[model samples]
Target: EPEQLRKLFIGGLSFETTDESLRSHFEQWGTLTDCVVMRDPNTKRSRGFGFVTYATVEEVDAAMNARPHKVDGRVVEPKRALTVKKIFVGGIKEDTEEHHLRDYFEQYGKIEVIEIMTDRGSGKKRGFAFVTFDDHDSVDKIVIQKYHTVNGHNCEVRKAL
Candidate 1:
């Protein structure tokens, strides 16, 4: 789990930010195992994001815990690579509640978080929910199982992109 915990996906890199600059920036927090900005071969342009691997899980902990990471002036985002298991539940009825999703999905495994999408102004359900489980297996089961029925409505589930 240390490897997974240590790896972070960085986004919103400036096009000019290269591997060495990315390394030099993140090196402020801890020792890095690897750092690279994905680039196009023909144009040799940065892909605006890359992956950073730290030598220890605690280093990543400090890197993320400190707050917004600024690399090359732009505030970049860093998210854990594989430890998060968030899913999108669609085709849900507007009347559905958080407990409804919990009642159904809890069968697969323990849920870490579940949020029913709602309109910010009206506070009405948006016919969908973002759910996260403690393990990837639960997400795999929900995705592979495909069709779901909750509150008499056929629902669809997929890993949140």
Candidate 2:
């Protein structure tokens, strides 16, 4: 069943691109089952990366692998998407600092990143972050978290998209 799945990762995006625009661009070759342009949580602006999920492998092979495509004046390339190890931590306090956030997850393993989302328009913290680990095995440790607070906020930790 997994052998027939089709998905594409799109990079090098313009922050102004929309779902409608991406759909219009890719639909020329096949129908898209799912699409998401990762957005800045507070301002709801594009984060410059997205995923295009296809229902049929045929569409993926035809459209995603064809060549480099441009959208909104930016050269966007598509490649087969890979599974990423990530965790979403929500309900963080506004005052939470990056160093403290890093400390919370340091117990798991080496952290690749702790992307504290911020409002693009005002530059304020977004109260949510995507924490990723370098070791795949570390992901299993936090399947069900027990932490109550980090830097003063009660956090809701869960798996990410």
Candidate 3:
């Protein structure tokens, strides 16, 4: 199946960053579906974050790989609009092990990286994990399905920040 279009989140924008500037910056790559710098409804000022969507994932890849990776002199990281390599799993059971976490999340698809959060010194599980899936589709399924439960605990499945 052909990879689908993705909604790439753009963060760390200068308050001066405008929609026209953003669209112009990325339009040189491919047809953009949406591009806007977020704004505060009340103040109508730049929210410092916005979303840029593309017609194909490859366009996003090219954008991310572009040298300098800066806009308006501010450094920015262009990751997949949706998580391809990682997702944040919060509210995990403290007793959960990495293998157990993997087994639980693998239900959606293949998982390659599983890092259970732990205290720096105690090394005890901090009730969360950052799980990376081999296929981006797994992230789509989990996110769109709105299901984040693992083992019996209802948890929060969020994109890695």
Candidate 4:
């Protein structure tokens, strides 16, 4: 019987790391099923962690062995490693208007929902947002391509939760 493939948490990612970049690094080991970079709740910046899914157990093992010790001059050991957590969307931007946020993330895939956080007072931009994709694979693509600067500011992506 073949060993079952499982999800692996990758840590110690640079704040600038993207899904494509991580995939490129890991592809030398084996075929990557998916990858994601966690984003900050407030600043929409990379949180220095992400997840990767491999097609097979051997591929996953190969990735672990070939993992880079550093990215962008930052040490990437398990201790200082990027914390990885398997989770689902918990909350999202309060001030982000639903339609606008949807338009932005829909570029990746069909959206499941747009959960925007709201302000207690005057109700203003909280500087963050959450968008759920119908397919997990889309999350990986979005994490990779969405890092380009928008309006002169770098944006980030992460697991919803």
Candidate No. with top TM-score: 1
Query: Cα RMSD to native, each candidate?
Result: 9.5, 14.5, 8.6, 15.8
lDDT of each candidate versus the true structure: 0.81, 0.74, 0.74, 0.57
Candidate 1 off by > 4 Å: 82-161
Counting clashing residue pairs in each candidate, in order, gives 0, 0, 1, 7
Compared with the true structure, what per-residue lDDT tens digits does model 1 show for residues 1-161?
35766787898999889899999988887999999899998998888999889998668767766558778889987776433488998888688888888999998768999988899999888899999887664675467553799878898887885
In what order do the candidates fall by TM-score, top score first? 1, 3, 2, 4
- TM-score of each candidate structure, all chains considered together: 0.51, 0.47, 0.49, 0.42
Model 4, span 1-161: residue lDDT tens: 13223455667888888888877766777777777778988998998888777777656556555545465566564221112221122223343356655565666557776655545696765666566666554464444342533333355556554
Clashing pairs in 3: 7-81
* Candidate 3 local distance difference test against the native: 0.74
Among residues 3 or more apart in sequence or in different chains, the pairs in candidate 4 whose N, CA or C atoms overlap within 3 Å are 11-82, 12-81, 12-82, 93-116, 93-117, 94-117, 94-118
Give the candidate number with the greatest lDDT: 1
For candidate 4, what is the TM-score?
0.42
